[PDB]
Amino acid sequence: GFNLKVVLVSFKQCLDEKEEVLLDPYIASWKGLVRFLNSLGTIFSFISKDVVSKLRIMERLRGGPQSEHYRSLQAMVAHELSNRLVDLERRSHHPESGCRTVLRLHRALHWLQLFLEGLRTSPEDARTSALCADSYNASLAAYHPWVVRRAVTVAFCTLPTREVFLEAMNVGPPEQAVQMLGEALPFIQRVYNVSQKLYAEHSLLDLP
Numbered sequence: 001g002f003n004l005k006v007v008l009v010s011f012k013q014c015l016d017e018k019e020e021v022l023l024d025p026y027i028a029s030w031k032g033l034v035r036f037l038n039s040l041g042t043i044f045s046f047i048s049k050d051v052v053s054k055l056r057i058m059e060r061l062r063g064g065p066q067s068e069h070y071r072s073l074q075a076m077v078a079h080e081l082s083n084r085l086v087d088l089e090r091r092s093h094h095p096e097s098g099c100r101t102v103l104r105l106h107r108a109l110h111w112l113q114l115f116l117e118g119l120r121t122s123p124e125d126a127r128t129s130a131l132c133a134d135s136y137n138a139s140l141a142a143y144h145p146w147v148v149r150r151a152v153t154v155a156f157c158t159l160p161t162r163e164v165f166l167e168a169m170n171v172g173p174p175e176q177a178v179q180m181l182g183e184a185l186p187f188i189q190r191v192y193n194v195s196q197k198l199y200a201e202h203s204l205l206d207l208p
């Protein structure tokens, strides 16, 4: 019943007719990713908590007195910039602003998209560990302190084989998994592109 396709396709729900990035569905989709990650039984389950803690921050903003301004990422950015609830230069009175919090998930989404795309078009003899590192170095690595970068990089060598990873998506044999990624990744890509435009245009790509 539960599989990676269900999660990827849930990202369709994150964009409305005006391509507002809706926060509730975004959270729901990320909870799907966490459940998938935890199902893989790798050492990276050690880091699921960081995602979960970030989702809870966002859920608490959605449960608060300004909940309506957190309905979409676009609304969130407008509200937090106009009320100075985002630390722009250095961490200060708003260490857990919606803007800086969502940024971390967004960067991770970028990594995930690069990793899954890499996997989708990889040769049969490609190593999962290499797909992960190359995509990590492309993306998330620059935002992590050296101690984290080095530990993550080493941990990559302990990942399952390409075949096992594809089968773990639970959508059939590797060949079916590969076609699934092609049909489903565009949903996560669209969410990423719209979110990246939002952050880029507001010069928020480097929030502390």
Ligand SMILES: CCCCCCCCCCCCC/C=C/[C@@H](O)[C@H](COP(=O)(O)O)NC(=O)CCCCCCCCCCC
Binding pocket: 033, 034, 036, 037, 040, 042, 044, 047, 050, 051, 104, 105, 107, 108, 111, 112, 132, 136, 140, 144, 148, 152, 208
């Ligand atoms: C299945 C193999 C998964 C490979 C995942 C490779 C990337 C792992 C990154 C681990 C980062 C170390 C944990 C804590 C990092 C935090 O410092 C940063 C910055 O947050 P801040 O401290 O400023 O609040 N947090 C992040 O970069 C977000 C956590 C990354 C989530 C990884 C996505 C895994 C989802 C997999 C779903 C298939």
